[PDB]
Design a protein around this nucleic acid. Structure first.
Lengths: 129, 91, 232, 100, 178, 103
RNA sequence: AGAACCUUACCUGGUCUUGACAUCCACGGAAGUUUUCAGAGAUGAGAAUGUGCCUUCGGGAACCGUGAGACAGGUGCUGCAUGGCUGUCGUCAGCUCGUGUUGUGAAAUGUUGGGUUAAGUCCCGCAACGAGCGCAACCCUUAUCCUUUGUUGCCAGCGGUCCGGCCGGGAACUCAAAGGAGACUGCCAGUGAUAAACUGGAGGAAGGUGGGGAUGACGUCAAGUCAUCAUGGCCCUUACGACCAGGGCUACACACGUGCUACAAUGGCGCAUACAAAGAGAAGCGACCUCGCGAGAGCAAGCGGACCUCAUAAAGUGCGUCGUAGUCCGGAUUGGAGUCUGCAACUCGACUCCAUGAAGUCGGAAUCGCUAGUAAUCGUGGAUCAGAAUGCCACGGUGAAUACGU
């Protein structure tokens, strides 16, 4: 319980800040409009795709701040950050969004570039003779 | 291409042999290590004996050669020809 | 010859550093040389005492030496004049005035570097070292710990081949990151050239001698820490 | 390695400081882009021939302890091998092994 | 080798339509890491399939993946001075991927002036069981029907299997004593 | 958002020295002044070094060392000459330099 | 780890031997500093500022010339004379310590079996018992999550308002650095000799000691460094030492190891557009500014680095554009100038730009890493760094096939 419920949208080590409240369906993305940020793009249809599914598109109001990631990919991070926030329409709500995997955090974490190695795991190539 | 940027070159190093040589117009080959130095109008008609790391090479300085440094007319490396290998260094 | 060096890996957890000073990047190269010099030049005066560690520290307008010894009085000397002469040559190397203080003496008959000095005499004095190593190991386990490892090198007796030997006993983990674990490698000369002993000694699997602070920000420091965070 | 390569540098740094320090900006004022329709005359710049070994472009220094050329690290005043030896023994403040 | 059965990651529905089968296609359509092109190049390919016949965007795609599908495989395992072939039965998990891999091999040479078309045209061919990889299943099953004759060092093994409560014949199949 | 009035910065290589030395400095500042704040933590720097592991050759195997540099800010809204005086009288740290200069 | 010159590590050429540099003694000079000319520079001659420090008041130290001895110095040779330190097999999954017993003994036994494990993991157990090393563990780091701090971090509403946390102001929120939370092959179920563990169930970010790292036994290989460095034996000691310059490590016949980028149109071109993380910069790097074809420039706010700046991070997004013709991909060579780092751009340095303009269309013999945040692929910063990155180190974007079976 919070004044405005909140999601962290952690997806593939980018974190999508997402503030939900009741309203008339309005959107803020990166302190600008949807039209500036996701212009003539499929990425505008991504953030709506989970909101349409729980049938609150014209009923939930939102404020969105996002760092790290790729332009297509950040829309993909906001798609977990919205479902993270949804927890209180019903007591079962977070259980079911977890069951669909859009609460379940992408547990796979980074492998450091390694010492004596060309990549994380790329060990040298040599024939040297 | 490469240049000497913006500041004034005669070479500091070459200057003390040259100022006494120009007074004569030209005199015996000026024993020079200063292969770092460029060719200029003041130097037309001098004879610069130019150390190449191994020995001195006389460069006769003249007007058709002012686009160059002294170090270019005196060689450094040896090139293995490839009919059959190069026997000698060439001056 | 495999393995990462055993003390090199402990400096972030449960072993403290040999040096603690601050140079803000730009002067660090000049400070590293100065910490080396105070280490070199100070030990040059105390050749005759017996010592387990050297620890160098730079507070504001200050350089503080800590030294670990076999008994408290050996470096203090007659009327404290010896330790004042030590503080004299730290003032001459260092860019600030100098202190030196004496540490707590701990396991001084079992210590890495005093055990290795002790074996080294046997190599100086050109004995075959056929039974010496086992009697070395026995004494270490009469004097404490839970295990010891010894490896002895240097052309024993003046031989013209390499001839090494080693001895391991009890429990000695080698690559351990938890507890302090006492290691020394000696370098020393005798008539036929250079000798050396590598000494790993193992006291316990957890030692607390270096830790990060106990507490978070709120219970730590000042009683009233909270901001208004607005609220005019 | 040799003590001569460090000896050469040690004479270079007393002469660098003696001639060049008051002349640092004699280059920017007399030579570079700030010398626009000002000076560019050789006769005030003919005085740098003695500082020729002491010049900032040969101040590559290498290791301070040994005089050994090549593979230097300016932040320790040391090199690869000898850095590793001092980190191995805890001589350097805050310096530890890496994991992440 | 290998102590226990070990798994696989599993791919998860794309963010712009909500299909796994589309998200599994775009992955082998990705060249030099550019997933964000390979996405549009698939959906615009699916949009081309919808233009030949408007009844579904998946119409010809879903059936291509049936029509070029391998049911059987050849594995190879040297016996001395010779390599030979020994057939093996294929997992479904490789059947789909093989079929999408032959579709993208065929698609990169189709030569039409944009990949959405190359891909859609090579799917349009595999939709009727007429395109390039029709051959490539058919041939592999032919080497698999023929090459059951040989088995992996059968002659000394052959008593060793029958005596171990096995059958009286060299099994030309993976992980058997033959 | 706030305007920077003054900068108190504590700098160290060692992570243990900087929290403890701060925890006394904040205490000393509350006991000898009336307007103190809980030390903003501020992000830690880390410098990357790689060197050989064998004396000569064995190029492949390598060794890597890291050194971190830690920053505490406190943020006293006005330091008194008597806070700064207590701070320097009750100082005992080596790992840390405290800066009462700003930049 | 950044070889125009220095790299004497090498070579040649100039030049000297108590010696470039240290201590000790003898003599002249204070060292420090400023300056003309010869000399390539070393070096040398002279001018001018100063006479400090101690003092048997001679004279000396510091530092410099000169000399003697002791001695300095040496990438000087020997790695089958070595020390220090570390590579290989290999994360092989083994190896040994203490001790008894059986054989005459070298040696076995344990360390082998059954089940299980990522592993000599762990249950059961035999004349092997007890115990240690390595894998395991503690360990750091990250992951949510809980917590405090509340800026140079943050903003759900509110004010100034270009609607930007810039600032009046605000604390719901990530968020940083630190207290640390959770997960134990545990519970419960199936299986397996409850017996380790694998699989199923569940809440939760996550169930296979959660992802990542640290991480390499005892040790052969007469492994590899006397060239970081220790050091005898042992050689030179007008030199196998040393100052200075020039040349050189990046030559060129070619072949070979390695990496990059391209060979396309999934792309390149153009105009317009978006968000990183992490770190370096008070010898330094730097907005705005005006100048410059661009590079850069001078001016200068600034920046101790969560502030300002490298940096508009690129791939990615919009739209038109091109058709296999080595092109609309690729853009190398070379002519020529503009600019940069530097007392020096010629062989061997960095950047812009104009004209002209090739190989290459998936590559023989050969040849290697990868099980998933990996493989693949883009951009960034940094160590080094006067001037040179395709390299290396680390960061973040986007991110794959499959692992049936032995």
């Amino acid at each position: 319980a919070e004044n405005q419920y909140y999601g962290t949208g952690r997806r593939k080590s980018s974190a999508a800040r997402v503030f939900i409240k009741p309203g008339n369906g309005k959107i803020v993305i990166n302190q600008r409009s949807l039209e500036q940020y996701f212009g003539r793009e499929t990425a505008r249809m991504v953030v709506r795709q989970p909101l349409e599914l729980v049938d609150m598109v014209e009923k939930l109001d939102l404020y969105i701040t996002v760092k790290g990631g790729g332009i297509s990919g950040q829309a993909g991070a906001i798609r977990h950050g919205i479902t993270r926030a949804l927890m209180e329409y019903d007591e079962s709500l977070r259980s079911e969004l977890r069951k669909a995997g859009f609460v379940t955090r992408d547990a796979r974490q980074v492998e450091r570039k390694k010492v004596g190695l060309r990549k994380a795991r790329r060990r040298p190539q040599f024939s040297k003779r | 291409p490469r240049s000497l940027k913006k500041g004034p070159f005669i070479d500091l190093h070459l200057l003390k042999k040259v100022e006494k040589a120009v007074e004569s117009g030209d005199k015996k080959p000026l024993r020079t290590w200063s292969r770092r130095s460029t060719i200029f109008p003041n130097m037309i008609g001098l004879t610069i004996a130019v150390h190449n790391g191994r020995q001195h090479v006389p460069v006769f300085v003249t007007d058709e050669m002012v686009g160059h440094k002294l170090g270019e007319f005196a060689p450094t490396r040896t090139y293995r020809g490839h009919a059959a290998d190069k026997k000698a260094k060439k001056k | 010859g495999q393995k990462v060096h055993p003390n090199g890996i402990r400096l972030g957890i449960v072993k403290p550093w040999n040096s603690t000073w601050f140079a803000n990047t730009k002067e660090f190269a000049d400070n590293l040389d100065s910490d080396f010099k105070v280490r070199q030049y100070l030990t040059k005066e105390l050749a005759k005492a017996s010592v387990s560690r050297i620890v160098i520290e730079r507070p504001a307008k200050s350089i503080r030496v800590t030294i670990h010894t076999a008994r408290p009085g050996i470096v203090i000397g007659k009327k404290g004049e010896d330790v004042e002469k030590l503080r004299k040559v730290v003032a001459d190397i260092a860019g600030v005035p100098a202190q030196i203080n004496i540490a707590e003496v701990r396991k001084p008959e079992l210590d890495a570097k005093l055990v290795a000095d002790s074996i080294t005499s046997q190599l100086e004095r050109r004995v075959m070292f056929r039974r010496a190593m086992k009697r070395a190991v026995q004494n270490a386990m009469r004097l404490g710990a839970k295990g010891i490892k010894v490896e002895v090198s240097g052309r024993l007796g003046g031989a013209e081949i390499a001839r090494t030997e080693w001895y391991r006993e009890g429990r000695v983990p080698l690559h351990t990151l938890r507890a302090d674990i006492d290691y020394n490698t000696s370098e020393a000369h005798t008539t036929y050239g250079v000798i050396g002993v590598k000494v790993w000694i193992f006291k316990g699997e957890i030692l607390g001698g270096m830790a990060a602070v106990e507490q978070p920000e709120k219970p730590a420091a000042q009683p009233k820490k909270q901001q208004r965070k607005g609220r005019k | 390695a040799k003590q001569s390569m460090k000896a050469r540098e040690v004479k270079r740094v007393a002469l660098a400081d003696k001639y060049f320090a008051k002349r640092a900006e004699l280059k920017a004022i007399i030579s570079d882009v700030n010398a626009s329709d000002e000076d560019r005359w050789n006769a005030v710049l003919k005085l740098q021939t003695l500082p020729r070994d002491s010049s900032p472009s040969r101040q590559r220094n290498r290791c301070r302890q040994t005089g050994r050329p090549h593979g230097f690290l300016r932040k320790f005043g040391l090199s690869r091998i000898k850095v590793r030896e001092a980190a191995m023994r805890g001589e350097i403040p805050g310096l530890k092994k890496a994991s992440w | 080798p290998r102590r226990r059965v070990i798994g696989q990651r599993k791919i998860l529905p794309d963010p712009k339509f909500g299909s796994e089968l589309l998200a599994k296609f775009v992955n082998i359509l990705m060249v030099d890491g550019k997933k964000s092109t390979a996405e549009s190049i698939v959906y615009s390919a699916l949009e081309t399939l919808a233009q030949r016949s408007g009844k579904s965007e998946l119409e010809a795609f879903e059936v291509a993946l049936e029509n070029v599908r391998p049911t059987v495989e050849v594995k190879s395992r040297r016996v001395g001075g010779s390599t030979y072939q020994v057939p093996v039965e294929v997992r479904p998990v490789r059947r789909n991927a093989l079929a999408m891999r032959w579709i993208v091999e065929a698609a990169r040479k189709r030569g039409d002036k944009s990949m959405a078309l190359r891909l859609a045209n090579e799917l349009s061919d595999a939709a009727e069981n007429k395109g390039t990889a029709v051959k490539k299943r058919e041939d592999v099953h032919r080497m698999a029907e023929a090459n059951k004759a040989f088995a992996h060092y059968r002659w000394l093994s052959l008593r060793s299997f029958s005596h171990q409560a096995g059958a009286s014949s060299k099994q030309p199949a993976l992980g058997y004593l033959n | 958002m706030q305007n920077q009035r003054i900068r108190i910065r504590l700098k160290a290589f060692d992570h243990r020295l900087i929290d403890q030395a701060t925890a006394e400095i904040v205490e000393t500042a509350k006991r000898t002044g009336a307007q103190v704040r809980g030390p903003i933590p501020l992000p830690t720097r880390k410098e990357r070094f790689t060197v050989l592991i064998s004396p000569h050759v064995n190029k492949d195997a390598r060794d890597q060392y890291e050194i971190r540099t830690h920053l505490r800010l406190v943020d006293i809204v006005e330091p008194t000459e008597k806070t700064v005086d207590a701070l320097m009288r009750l100082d005992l740290a080596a790992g840390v330099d405290v800066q009462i200069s700003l930049g």
